[PDB]
Amino acid sequence: GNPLVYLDVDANGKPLGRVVLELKADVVPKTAENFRALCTGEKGFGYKGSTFHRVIPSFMCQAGDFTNHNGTGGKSIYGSRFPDENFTLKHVGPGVLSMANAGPNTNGSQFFICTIKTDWLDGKHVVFGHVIEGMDVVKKIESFGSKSGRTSKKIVITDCGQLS
C-alpha cells in the first residue's frame, strides 16, 4: 500500500510529538517517493535536523528547506527541481500535505501541512498526502507561527522515517 512516514518535532528542544503522514503514491508516485526518501534519508540527505521555517496561523505550517532553512533552498532526490506531477488531489481541509513551490514545475523538498481548507492553491500546488495522526502536534506548531510566517520557537524535525 501507500507509504506511511513520520516526523518527530521539537519546539525549543521540547518534544511536541509525532506527525504521521500517508503519502498518496497511488495518485502521485513520483512526488510521494521524493518525500518518502527524504524522510528515511536513504539518498544521503533529507529532513532530519531541519526546521519548520514558515508557519502562519489559520493557514499552514511549512518545512523542508534542509539546505538554507529559510524557504530559498531544498532539493529533490531527482535533482534540484521536478515537475508538477498532477493536480488530482485537492486542498480539502486541515491535515492536507502539499508541495511548496516557486511557481509551476519547481518542486524540490519544501512542503506544507494545511491547518484550514486552502482551496485557492488547487491547481498550483501538488497535494500528495495527509495527516493520519498528530493533528495536535500540527496545531501546536501552528500556535508558534505568526502572520509574517516567522516562528516564535525553533521548530525542528528531530527524527523522521518510514513506518510502512
Residue numbers in the entry: 44 to 207
From the paper:
Cyclophilins are peptidyl-prolyl cis/trans isomerases (PPIase) that catalyse the interconversion of the two energetically preferred conformers (cis and trans) of the planar peptide bond preceding an internal proline residue. CypD is localized in the matrix of the mitochondria and acts as a key regulator of the opening of the mitochondrial permeability transition pore (mPTP), which plays a major role in calcium efflux from mitochondria to the cytosol and can lead to mitochondrial swelling and cell death. Cyclophilins adopt an eight-stranded anti-parallel P-barrel structure. Their PPIase catalytic groove is formed by a mixture of hydrophobic, aromatic and polar residues, including Arg55, Phe60, Met61, Gln63, Asn102, Phe113, Trp121, Leu122 and His126. The existence of a deep pocket contiguous to the canonical catalytic site, called the ‘gatekeeper' pocket, has been revealed.
Ten fragment hits with low-affinity dissociation constants (millimolar range) were identified. Their scaffolds and proline-mimicking motifs were used to select in cerebro a set of 52 derivative fragments for subsequent X-ray crystallographic experiments. Apo CypD crystals were soaked with each of the 52 fragments. X-ray structures of CypD complexed with 14 fragments were obtained. The half-maximal inhibitory concentrations (IC50) of the 14 fragments were >5 mM in all instances.
